[PDB]
Amino acid sequence: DHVCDDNFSCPAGSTCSSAFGFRNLSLVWGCSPVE
């Protein structure tokens, strides 16, 4: 399994959307399906 930032994970079955990159005061995103 993977692990982006901290509270997150994905069995290489998606990607870390990654959001809140203008200062990082909470970080809120999800995993995206590569296909």
Side-chain angles (χ1 to χ4, degrees), residues 17-29:
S17 296
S18 204
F20 254 75
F22 76 91
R23 240 204 100 203
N24 301 57
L25 43 144
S26 221
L27 278 295
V28 63
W29 27 283

Side-chain angles (χ1 to χ4, degrees), residues 1-2 6-7 9-15 18 21-22 24-28 30-31 33:
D1 56 84
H2 210 6
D6 273 84
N7 51 276
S9 79
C10 247
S14 274
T15 34
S18 204
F22 76 91
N24 301 57
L25 43 144
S26 221
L27 278 295
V28 63
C31 222

